[PDB]
Amino acid sequence: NHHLYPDELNVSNNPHYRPKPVSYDSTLPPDHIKVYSRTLFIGGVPLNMKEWDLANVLKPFAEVQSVILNNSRKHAFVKVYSRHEAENVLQNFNKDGALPLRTRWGVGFGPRDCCDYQHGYSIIPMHRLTDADKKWSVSAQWGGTSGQPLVTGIVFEEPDII
RNA sequence: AGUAAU
């Protein structure tokens, strides 16, 4: 929809193939989960830049999945295929400051007040997910649990949605 | 200097 490719699949032949790191965490409270964001807040976006441009600038540092661009509000929302890639973009993209683009964290999944914008994850109580969220969490193409059921402690990369 | 679509 706002993806580059709508009906694409996370499979070994797709050059966008990624793993789905799942891990568990004993320091979480009961019936809470951890979610690492793959979504990026980009700000200082010029008027001349289209969606294609942004994706193409990040291309060396990360492969982009989806780009919602609010051109009038001089910012955008860029989901990349993996957490590793998003993390790379934050340190290493535009170090010199040649472009006007500031690149910070952004929230793709779960409540906003549950997100740590600084470190870039959400610790979410399972009751605050909707039926839809709980579905996508387990059956997402990129990110999610890759079939593993949701339980206390689980940690996984932000899933895709509708 | 802008954190949204749902």
From Swiss-Prot:
This is Protein NRD1. It comes from the Eukaryota. Residues 38-108 form the RRM domain. One of its GO terms (cellular component) is nucleus. Present with 19600 molecules/cell in log phase SD medium. Its main location: nucleus. One of its GO terms (biological process) is nuclear mRNA surveillance. Keywords: Nucleus, Phosphoprotein, RNA-binding. Plays a role in sequence-specific regulation of nuclear pre-mRNA abundance. It comes from Saccharomyces cerevisiae (strain ATCC 204508 / S288c). It is found in: Nucleus. GO terms for molecular function: mRNA binding; protein domain specific binding; RNA binding; transcription regulatory region RNA binding.
